């Protein structure tokens, strides 16, 4: 029972790309030819990835081989198809039309099998909706390794909604999907690296228009993406903070502005700042918005945006009293880049320059962002 199969090279290159992003045994990939499919298994300390791709199975069997060596070779081969043949002397032959590679294999019995999940809840959502909630929350995870519980994305069902939420203490990001069926409340914290891997998977063109099944338990999360890709992940063992208290419940005024002109202007003005004072200042009035910054021993900068009801230059602030408030420009940019929207809204809770600011994008009612100001 020796593996032998013919595979479309471009298909194998894509699967190996996912395997590379997962990672002595962790350096290997397990290849299993069975029932018309090649199953590729990859694992590290926190993730187990199993991918099935259709191939011509000429003989069923299993081998394991270096992930890096296999990937490096296959992505340099110009043949539209490759033959993979397990040979007697613990070697995998990779054959193109004019070239042949023989790779040392390692015992299949040394490669770990996947663990299992006893889900508390399971549900199906579209890959496109799941990609959105991860894209809207992955950037505001804490990188402070002491804040163990903030080092991932909180995925939780509450009422009929599936939320992703993240915070680092300076900003909060929330994005959700409505679930049709009744599902009990449950939550887990997905590690950053697992969020990055599952995002790459669902965004693949083969999967982005399909569905992903999600299974949650107290100690694991399992993704089944478009039937043929399974990702099992450990969780962060912590309790996510109750962030509902962080969300402003009322506003005294709001800024509405063309998202691109706002993002581009923040980026230009922020160039003058120094690491010790990463801050830009917004001076808001009905007639104009001034964006300014200073940098010690560097200089200063300002840009003026004038009131406009035209979509491409939109600026309005319907309040008689002006407001001056500051923000970390990187944190504002993170939000503005997360949602492809023509306009963005900033809601101010009170006249102070210290209260949290709520950010929403019109036409995107299932994304909420909160950013703390900085003194300027």
């Amino acid at each position: 029972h020796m593996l032998k199969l013919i595979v479309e090279t471009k298909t194998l290159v894509q699967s190996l790309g996912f395997a590379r992003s997962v990672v002595p045994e962790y350096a290997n990939i397990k290849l299993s030819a069975k029932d018309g499919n090649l199953e590729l298994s990859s694992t590290n300390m926190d993730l187990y990835l199993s991918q099935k791709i259709a191939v011509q199975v000429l003989s069923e069997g299993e081998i394991t081989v270096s992930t890096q060596t296999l990937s490096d070779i296959v992505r340099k081969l110009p043949d539209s198809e490759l033959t993979l043949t397990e040979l007697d002397i613990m070697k995998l032959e990779i054959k193109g039309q004019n070239c042949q590679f023989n790779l040392f294999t390692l015992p299949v019995s040394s490669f770990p099998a996947m663990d299992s999940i006893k889900p508390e809840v399971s549900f199906k959502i579209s890959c496109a909706d799941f990609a959105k909630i991860i894209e809207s929350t992955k950037f505001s995870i804490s990188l402070d390794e002491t804040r163990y519980n903030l080092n991932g994305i909180y995925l939780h069902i509450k009422d009929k909604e599936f939320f992703a939420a993240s915070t680092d203490g300076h900003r909060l990001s929330i994005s959700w999907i409505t679930l049709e069926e009744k599902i009990k409340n449950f939550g887990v914290i997905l590690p950053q690296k697992s969020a990055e891997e599952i995002l790459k998977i669902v965004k693949d063109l083969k999967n982005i228009h399909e569905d992903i099944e999600i299974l949650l338990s107290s100690n694991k999360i399992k993704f089944i993406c478009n039937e043929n890709t399974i990702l099992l992940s450990k969780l962060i063992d912590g309790t996510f903070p109750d962030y509902s208290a962080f969300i402003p419940k009322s506003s005294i005024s709001k800024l509405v502005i063309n998202r691109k002109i706002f993002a581009d202007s923040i980026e230009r003005i922020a160039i003058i700042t120094v690491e010790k004072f990463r801050a830009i200042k917004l001076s808001l009035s009905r007639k104009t918005l001034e964006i300014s910054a200073v940098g010690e021993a560097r200089g200063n900068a300002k840009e003026i945006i004038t009131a406009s009801q035209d979509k491409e230059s939109f600026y309005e602030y319907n309040c008689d009293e002006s407001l001056v408030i500051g923000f970390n420009p990187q944190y504002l940019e993170d939000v503005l880049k997360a949602v492809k929207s023509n306009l963005v809204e900033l809601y101010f809770s009170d006249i102070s320059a210290s209260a949290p600011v709520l950010i929403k994008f019109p036409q995107n009612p299932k994304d909420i962002f909160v950013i703390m100001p900085v003194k300027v």
């Binding site: 203490g169 300076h170 909060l172 903070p241 962080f246 949290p356 703390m372 100001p373 900085v374 003194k375």
Partner: peptide, 10 residues
């Protein structure tokens, strides 16, 4: 650089 009202943490 004030934080969100995280208790504890701020």
């Amino acid at each position: 650089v004030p934080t969100l009202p995280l208790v504890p943490x701020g």
